[PDB]
Amino acid sequence: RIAGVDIPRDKRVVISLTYIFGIGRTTAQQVLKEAGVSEDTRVRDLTEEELGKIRDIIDKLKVEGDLRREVSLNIKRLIEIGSYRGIRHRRGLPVRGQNSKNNARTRK
Amino acid sequence: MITKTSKNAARLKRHARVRAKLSGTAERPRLNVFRSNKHIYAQIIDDVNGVTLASASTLDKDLNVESTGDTSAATKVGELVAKRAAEKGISDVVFDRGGYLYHGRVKALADAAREAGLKF
Amino acid sequence: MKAGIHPNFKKATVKCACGNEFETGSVKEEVRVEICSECHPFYTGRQKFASADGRVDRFNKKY
Amino acid sequence: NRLKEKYNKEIAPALMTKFNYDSVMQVPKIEKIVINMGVGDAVQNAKAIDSAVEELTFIAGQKPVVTRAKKSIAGFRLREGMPIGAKVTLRGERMYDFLDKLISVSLPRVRDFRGVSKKSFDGRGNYTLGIKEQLIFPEIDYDKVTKVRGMDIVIVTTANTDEEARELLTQVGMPF
RNA sequence: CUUAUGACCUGGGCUACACACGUGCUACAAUGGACAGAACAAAGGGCAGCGAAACCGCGAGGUUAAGCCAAUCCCACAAAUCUGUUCUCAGUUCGGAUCGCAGUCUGCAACUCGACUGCGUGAAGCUGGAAUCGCUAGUAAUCGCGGAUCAGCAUGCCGCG
RNA sequence: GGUCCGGUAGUUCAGUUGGUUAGAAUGCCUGCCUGUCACGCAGGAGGUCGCGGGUUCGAGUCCCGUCCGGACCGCCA
RNA sequence: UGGUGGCGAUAGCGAAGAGGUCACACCCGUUCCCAUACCGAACACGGAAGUUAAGCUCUUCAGCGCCGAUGGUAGUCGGGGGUUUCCCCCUGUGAGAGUAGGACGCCGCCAA
RNA sequence: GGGGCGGUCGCCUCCUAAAAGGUAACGGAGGCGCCCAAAGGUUCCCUCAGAAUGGUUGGAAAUCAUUCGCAGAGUGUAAAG
Numbered sequence: 001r002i003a004g005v006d007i008p009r010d011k012r013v014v015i016s017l018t019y020i021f022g023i024g025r026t027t028a029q030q031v032l033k034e035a036g037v038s039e040d041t042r043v044r045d046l047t048e049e050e051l052g053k054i055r056d057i058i059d060k061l062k063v064e065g066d067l068r069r070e071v072s073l074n075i076k077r078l079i080e081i082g083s084y085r086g087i088r089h090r091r092g093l094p095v096r097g098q099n100s101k102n103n104a105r106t107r108k
Numbered sequence: 109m110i111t112k113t114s115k116n117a118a119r120l121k122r123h124a125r126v127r128a129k130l131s132g133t134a135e136r137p138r139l140n141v142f143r144s145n146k147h148i149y150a151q152i153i154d155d156v157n158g159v160t161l162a163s164a165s166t167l168d169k170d171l172n173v174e175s176t177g178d179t180s181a182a183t184k185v186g187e188l189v190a191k192r193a194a195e196k197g198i199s200d201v202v203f204d205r206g207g208y209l210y211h212g213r214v215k216a217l218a219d220a221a222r223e224a225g226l227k228f
Numbered sequence: 229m230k231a232g233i234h235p236n237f238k239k240a241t242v243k244c245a246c247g248n249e250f251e252t253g254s255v256k257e258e259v260r261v262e263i264c265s266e267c268h269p270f271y272t273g274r275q276k277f278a279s280a281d282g283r284v285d286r287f288n289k290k291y
Numbered sequence: 292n293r294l295k296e297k298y299n300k301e302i303a304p305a306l307m308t309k310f311n312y313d314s315v316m317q318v319p320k321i322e323k324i325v326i327n328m329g330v331g332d333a334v335q336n337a338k339a340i341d342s343a344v345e346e347l348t349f350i351a352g353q354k355p356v357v358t359r360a361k362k363s364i365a366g367f368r369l370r371e372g373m374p375i376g377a378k379v380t381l382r383g384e385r386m387y388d389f390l391d392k393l394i395s396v397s398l399p400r401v402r403d404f405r406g407v408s409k410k411s412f413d414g415r416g417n418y419t420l421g422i423k424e425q426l427i428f429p430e431i432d433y434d435k436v437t438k439v440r441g442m443d444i445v446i447v448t449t450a451n452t453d454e455e456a457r458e459l460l461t462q463v464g465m466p467f
Numbered sequence: 468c469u470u471a472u473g474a475c476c477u478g479g480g481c482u483a484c485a486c487a488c489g490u491g492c493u494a495c496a497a498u499g500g501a502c503a504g505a506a507c508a509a510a511g512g513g514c515a516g517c518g519a520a521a522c523c524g525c526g527a528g529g530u531u532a533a534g535c536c537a538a539u540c541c542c543a544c545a546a547a548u549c550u551g552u553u554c555u556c557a558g559u560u561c562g563g564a565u566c567g568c569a570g571u572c573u574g575c576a577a578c579u580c581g582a583c584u585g586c587g588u589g590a591a592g593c594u595g596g597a598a599u600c601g602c603u604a605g606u607a608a609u610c611g612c613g614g615a616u617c618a619g620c621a622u623g624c625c626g627c628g
Numbered sequence: 629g630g631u632c633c634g635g636u637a638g639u640u641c642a643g644u645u646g647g648u649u650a651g652a653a654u655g656c657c658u659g660c661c662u663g664u665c666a667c668g669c670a671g672g673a674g675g676u677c678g679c680g681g682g683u684u685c686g687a688g689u690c691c692c693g694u695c696c697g698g699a700c701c702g703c704c705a
Numbered sequence: 706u707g708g709u710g711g712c713g714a715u716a717g718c719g720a721a722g723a724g725g726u727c728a729c730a731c732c733c734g735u736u737c738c739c740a741u742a743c744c745g746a747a748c749a750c751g752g753a754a755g756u757u758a759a760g761c762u763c764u765u766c767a768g769c770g771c772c773g774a775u776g777g778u779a780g781u782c783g784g785g786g787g788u789u790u791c792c793c794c795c796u797g798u799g800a801g802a803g804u805a806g807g808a809c810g811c812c813g814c815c816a817a
Numbered sequence: 818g819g820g821g822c823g824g825u826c827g828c829c830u831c832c833u834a835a836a837a838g839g840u841a842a843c844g845g846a847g848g849c850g851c852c853c854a855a856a857g858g859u860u861c862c863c864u865c866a867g868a869a870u871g872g873u874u875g876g877a878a879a880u881c882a883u884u885c886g887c888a889g890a891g892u893g894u895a896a897a898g
Contacts, residue, residue, distance in 0.1 A: 011554090110447060122862085153814085157813095178750095206708095206709095211738080253388045270405070316759095322746080323746085354743060362685080364879065383745080413869095416883085418871080421871095
């Protein structure tokens with residue numbers, strides 16, 4: 001729809017474009033202000049040109065179809081590059097130096 | 109290129125299939141048709157001697173019609189081969205469609221022969 | 229066509245967002261297209277005009 | 292229709308000069324596009340195929356055919372006789388209509404797209420494609436779809452070798 | 468023992484990880500969350516230190532720098548609270564875990580092995596079995612704020628309202 | 629030597645019939661209680677069916693054969 | 706050259722090469738009979754734009770497949786022996802997988 | 818192949834069976850005491866099993882597409898034809 005992904009239609013547009021992969025709340029709000037399309041709209045009943053002038057700005061920033069693969073390529077680069085950080089990523093152990101005695105059930 | 113069978117080659121199996129059940133002897137000869145995409149032929153065959161009694165076609169040298177491939181020509185060639193049966197009269201003939209389906213120009217030939225008077 | 233068991237088929241034009249045309253049939257009557265084959269960058273030959281792309285391995289601490 | 296006009300006018304002449312065919316009707320021609328649904332049924336819910344049938348009759352222009360399983364295999368708990376998968380063949384103006392929709396709207400609307408696979412060939416000039424999403428043309432009512440099983444696409448040509456089909460499908464419009 | 472259980476030096480380890488126990492912190496939400504506005508404390512610290520205002524930087528912070536050996540100056544804009552707008556009961560504008568990217572400070576040095584910022588991603592978790600604990604009023608429960616230790620590092624401790 | 633029985637979690641028995649689900653006590657592990665241990669209270673895994681072969685979409689459970697045990701009989705001179 | 710037949714594929718499967726004005730067939734488009742458990746490739750429907758590409762017909766070849774007696778044997782009827790769970794002699798009879806080669810068609814009947 | 822004990826007693830299929838039919842044994846192998854309102858009757862139309870290659874859920878095989886493929890597959894059920 002917007003960039004591949006659909007949008008929950010009955011909500012505010014600022015909350016709704018964060019469901020796409022690549023922009024959070026703060027980054028969404030400033031591109032939405034540059035878009036100039038109100039920023040307090042229900043996306044169910046906006047019009048087509050204010051729908052469409054954000055396409056060009058999300059084209060020149062970057063989203064899932066590119067961020068997913070570049071973070072994948074960078075992380076497998078870190079994998080086979082031979083780093084301690086890469087081998088920790090491989091083995092599922094924590095990476096940011098946290099202790100493995102008592103925690104990190106988020107991984108493994 | 110995908111193997112598309114020849115329509116005539118597929119037709120031979122159905123014609124042999126129907127010919128296994130029936131054949132045209134003396135004083136009970138076999139009707140025979142051809143349904144080429146441009147012309148319709150009719151033939152009368154005696155099997156015990158391998159000879160033909162009478163025959164007709166759309167490309168006969170007379171009664172040519174701009175149809176020459178339609179049901180009007182089918183009726184005309186049917187009653188043509190009906191009088192061809194009549195002069196050396198058999199007055200009886202068994203039916204044998206040539207691996208076709210009894211609905212179209214073959215049917216036109218059939219009731220052409222019927223009302224012209226070759227008893228089936 | 230066994231009638232009734234097939235849905236209705238009719239002429240149904242295409243409006244891309246870029247405004248490109250296409251003489252198309254569909255079961256519906258009208259389709260809004262967000263991105264066409266003349267503007268989606270892979271079918272723009274090879275990234276003709278839709279790109280924000282590039283990748284380097286840069287090792288620069290000179291500031 | 293438009294594709295038929297372009298194929299008659301320019302596609303077939305260009306390739307017949309390119310392969311130097313003596314008879315101009317030795318030209319390769321796309322024969323049938325068949326769309327085959329497959330459900331991992333195995334007696335889980337009857338309504339999966341009973342939804343995919345009328346989804347595919349909206350994707351194409353006519354009703355599909357519920358395929359019949361050949362033999363039972365208990366490796367899926369598949370009893371022979373209960374229905375699995377759907378199929379529909381497309382030909383005539385219909386095939387060019389569907390390929391039109393494909394090239395025009397469908398592949399650009401995939402969530403992520405790189406070039407179509409280089410060597411999905413049979414070895415004898417046929418091609419097979421696998422897509423993961425039902426979102427082919429945008430006027431499917433996308434809110435009604437529940438399951439996410441995409442489609443299987445089989446184009447059959449009169450190509451005897453892979454190279455002629457490979458070259459002709461380029462000017463058909465398949466990216467590579 | 469002085470031809471090492473004594474010294475010197477570099478690097479590593481004291482921070483590991485299939486699991487278990489304890490003590491704490493934070494959540495599972497609308498007596499809420501986000502955004503704007505309005506306030507109202509005590510108690511301490513500051514000279515190889517506190518470092519104002521102003522300017523730059525989205526922000527961590529950076530720059531020139533006022534004053535203060537302090538009931539003058541600085542740390543230092545307290546928060547909870549109240550008023551209004553919005554969200555409309557969902558794994559969510561809850562929750563932020565873990566990760567990728569780009570940075571800030573300190574320090575010879577931030578990889579094992581620091582903290583912080585802007586990003587993007589967004590985890591489990593929708594009140595917790597058998598059990599079991601603290602607490603007789605400014606207490607409990609919640610709300611922030613100081614200090615020590617100190618190049619940098621606090622959810623811990625001590626104390627303050 | 630013949631005939632008939634059974635061969636299942638570590639142990640003991642169901643399921644072995646229902647061809648189309650592998651279960652129950654006990655044991656073991658973890659947590660709770662107790663000063664500690666034992667009782668007692670919460671949680672959890674396990675076997676993939678004596679073996680081999682054959683039928684069927686599909687065998688623990690159908691049919692043969694091999695092995696292990698048990699019961700019965702092995703008589704008339 | 707087309708239609709239809711009989712002969713054990715000695716008829717085939719292969720590999721190559723030619724043909725189409727006529728005939729045959731690919732083709733054209735489903736409108737009305739009729740149809741596609743979905744569809745004019747399929748059934749039919751009614752034409753004739755170009756096409757020997759395929760189908761089909763002829764030309765060549767022993768690669769495969771097929772047919773194939775001659776003299777040899779194995780076996781065996783009947784006699785006759787022997788050291789006899791099996792061997793031997795004679796009058797006959799005649800194995801097949803092996804080659805000599807044959808064959809990559811023979812005869813009609815109706816429409817050119 | 819003394820009786821007892823064991824096993825068997827009717828019907829169907831193959832081998833034993835000596836190239837017609839038949840042919841015994843406590844000889845060698847299996848099945849049957851049904852099922853099918855169509856798994857019949859006619860009419861009409863097709864054609865397998867397996868393998869190779871592509872295709873996602875999806876594979877060792879679910880469903881498609883192509884090619885090879887005399888019969889390996891089916892033929893309600895035992896074997897034979």
